[PDB]
Structures are given as C-alpha cells and as structure tokens.
C-alpha cells in the first residue's frame, strides 16, 4: 500500500516484468488477431479517458498489459500474469500515483503504451519487445528504482 | 516425433515461455549468483553426469538445474514462477529427454548445453548466459520438431 523504503521490492517486480512483457510483446507482434487488437485498443481508449478522470486507471493499465499477454495466444503467458496480478497492481498503482503529481507525465506514459500497440500492430517483434521494455525501464526510472 | 497437434502446440508454448523466463534468469544469475548458488547448479550437473541408470531421475535433476538458475537471480518472483510451472517443466523436460535418448550420443551433446549455461554464469557474463540459456531451449524445441 506504499513505496518509500519498498524500492528494492518494486525493483524486483519491474525487473521480472521486463523479461515477461518484452517476450509477450514480441510474441503478440507475430500472433495478434483482430480480436486481440480490439482488446488492446479498447484498453488504450479507456486509458485516454483517465488522463482527465483518473479513477480505475490502474485496472485499465493492467487490462492493457493483460491484453498483450492474451495476444500471444500462449496460455502460460496469460496464466503467469494472472498469477502475478497482485504484484502488477502494486507496481502499476505505485507508478501511476507517482506519475500524476507531474506535468502531463500521465500523457507521456500513455504514449509509451501506444508505442507497444503500434509495434504489435505492425507485426514487428523486435520493435515490440524494445517498446515494451522501454515502458518498464522508464517507469522504473520515474520511480528511481535503479535496476 | 509422435505427438498430437495439441500436444505439439502445448510443448511449443512451454518452450516459448521458458526462452523468455530462463534467458532472463540466466542473465540475472550471471550478475548475482553467490557460492551457494554455484554449488546448487554444480550439484545438479554432477547428478546429471551419472545418467544411465534412470531417466526419471534424469528429468528431476534437469529441472533442478534450471530451478537453481532461477534461485540464483535472488529475485523472489523468478523462483516462485518456476515452481508454479513445475508440471509444465516436467512435461517438456521428460518429453525432450525421452526423445534425445533415441539418438546415440545426443544426451552428451545436451549435457554440454547445460554446461554452457553454468560456465557463462560462473564467468559472470550476462549476455553470454542469456544466449546459452535460450540456445539450449531452442535446440530442445528443434530436436522435438516444434517449429517455434
Ligand atoms: O509510469 C507510470 O506512471 C505507469 C507505469 C505503468 O503503466 C506500468 O505498467 O508499470
Ligand atoms: O502449482 C500451482 O500452484 C498451480 C500449478 C499451475 O501452474 C498448473 O499447472 O495448472
Ligand atoms: O533436449 C533434451 O534432450 C533435454 C532438454 C531439457 O534439458 C530441457 O531443459 O528442456
Ligand atoms: Cl544433461
Ligand atoms: Zn503500463
Ligand atoms: Zn535442460
């Protein structure tokens, strides 16, 4: 429920997400179908509304990354992200609460999410992996985690 | 290889996920492993060297080696995830090792794949450790004709 002296624990979640979600983005770039695109795009639209009404932004952020995991068409990726759901909520909600005290930083975060969608849409697995890990490295650096 | 289409898809899915998880674990282990971690990995490799008598024991020492690499990340969540996947690991590893015993000398070749991961981690070389880990899983998937 907080994060002052919990940085090393946050760093452990983000560092694991970097290997899982980079791999999921690259798989999704190869296997996504029209139904997957709609799931990611609907999450991205709901995330555009939270730029002004920030309630449930954590659920929609998570739903976006879960939609990428579903787009791999690999049941074990999906089950791993559901198994780690509590850690995702901890990391996401900590990162978003921190982000909303600055700028349109929330809008810079929204762009990082869109960049992963865009590379998955193009079917470019290397670009998708790099965009997914950059989102996590930038979220960690915004939290001063030092991975 | 003889497998239903769904079995081949399931095996390909396990190896796909392992490549991302275990490639990352090996890179982290190359940074963080201590002398106890090295002992645990070498203990599994030594047990694997005495292979002939029973394959069922061979499967468990293979999984224990990969789990030891995950524990050597010193990341609470990596180790837990590999335990969570213990049934999928045993499925993949038992299918693979049974298949490799069909070709004379193949099991010794596979053993050098495990040594290469251990050696990279011992040397503290993350990029080398990641490559050896993913290459082991790529070759296993290809021995099984999974067409990843
Ligand atoms: O950096 C943020 O504010 C949000 C990061 C969040 O979207 C995440 O997936 O960790
Ligand atoms: O070990 C568990 O807790 C559940 C195992 C799960 O990965 C499964 O194989 O269905
Ligand atoms: O390919 C083999 O013969 C064994 C593969 C096994 O070591 C594994 O970790 O999946
Ligand atoms: Cl072996
Ligand atoms: Zn996010
Ligand atoms: Zn192995």
For position A131, which CATH number holds? Answer: 1.20.120.530
- How far apart CA A83 and CA A63 sit, in angstroms, is 14
Strand, helix or coil for residue A71:
helix
Cα dihedral across residues B105, B106, B111, B112: positive or negative: positive
State which approach was used to obtain the coordinates. X-ray
A102 located within any domain: yes
Is the CB of residue A14 less than 8 Å from the CB of residue A140?
yes
CB-based pocket (< 6 A), ligand 2: B 84-85, 87-88
The reply to whether A57 touches chain B by the CB within 8 Å rule is no
Number of domains observed in the structure of chain A:
1
* Residues contacting B52, CB < 8 A, separation 6+: none
A22 contact B CB<8A: yes
Using the atom order of ligand 1, give the atom closest to the CA of residue A96.
Answer: 3
Please report, in angstroms and rounded to a whole number, the separation of the first and last CA atoms in chain B: 15
| Contact assessment for residue A67 and residue A39, using Cβ atoms and an 8 Å cutoff | yes
Give dist(CA B123, CA B103) in Å, integer. Answer: 32
Q: Which residues contact A97 (CB under 8 A, 6 or more apart)?
A: none
Q: Record the tokens describing residue B95, joined without a space.
A: 């299918």
In a domain, B95, yes or no: yes
Say whether residue A6 is in contact with chain B using an 8 A CB cutoff.
no
Range of the domain at A32: 7-142
- Ligand 4 is an ion; its neighbours by CB within 5 Å are B 48, 111
CB A21 within 8 Å of CB A65: yes
After which residues do gaps appear in chain B, with C to N over 2.5 Å?
A: none
Question: Which of the 8 DSSP states describes residue B50?
Answer: S
B114 inside domain: yes
Measured in degrees and rounded to the nearest 5, phi and psi for residue A60 equal -75, -40
Half-sphere exposure of A13 (CA within 13 A, CB side): 23
Q: Can you tell me whether residue B56 is helix, strand or coil?
A: helix
- Interchain contact, A83 vs B85, CB within 8 Å: no
Domain for residue A116, yes or no? yes
Using CB atoms, pick whichever of B16, B25, B77 lies closest to residue A74: B16
A64 belongs to a structural domain? yes
Q: Point out the ligand 3 atom lying closest to the alpha carbon of residue B89.
A: 10
Q: How many residues does chain B have?
A: 148
Which chain B residues have a beta carbon less than 8 Å from that of A83?
81, 84
Burial grade of A76 (CB within 10 A; 0-12, 13-18, 19 or more): buried
Per the document, the length of chain A is 147
In a domain, A147, yes or no: no
Continuous segment of H or E residues that includes residue B131? helix B126-143
- Whether B148 is covered by a domain: the verdict is no
The rounded Cα A141 to chain-centroid distance in angstroms is 15
CA of A101 to the centre of ligand 4 (A): 53
Q: Report if residue A2 sits inside a domain.
A: no
């Amino acid at each position: 429920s907080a994060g002052l002296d919990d940085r090393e624990q946050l760093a452990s979640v983000y560092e694991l997400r970097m290997e899982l979600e980079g791999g999921a983005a690259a798989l999704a770039a190869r296997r996504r179908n029209a139904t997957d695109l709609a799931a990611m795009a609907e999450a991205l639209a709901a995330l555009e509304a939270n730029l002004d009404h920030p309630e449930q932004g954590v659920e929609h952020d998570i739903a976006f990354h879960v939609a990428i995991a579903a787009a791999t068409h690999n049941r074990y990726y999906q089950d791993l992200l559901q198994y780690l759901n509590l850690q995702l909520r901890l990391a996401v909600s900590t990162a978003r609460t921190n982000s909303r005290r600055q700028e349109g930083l929330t809008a810079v975060v929204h762009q990082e999410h869109v960049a992963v969608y865009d590379a998955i849409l193009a079917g470019d697995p290397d670009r998708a992996r790099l965009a997914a890990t950059r989102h996590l490295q930038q979220a960690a650096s915004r939290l001063r985690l030092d991975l």
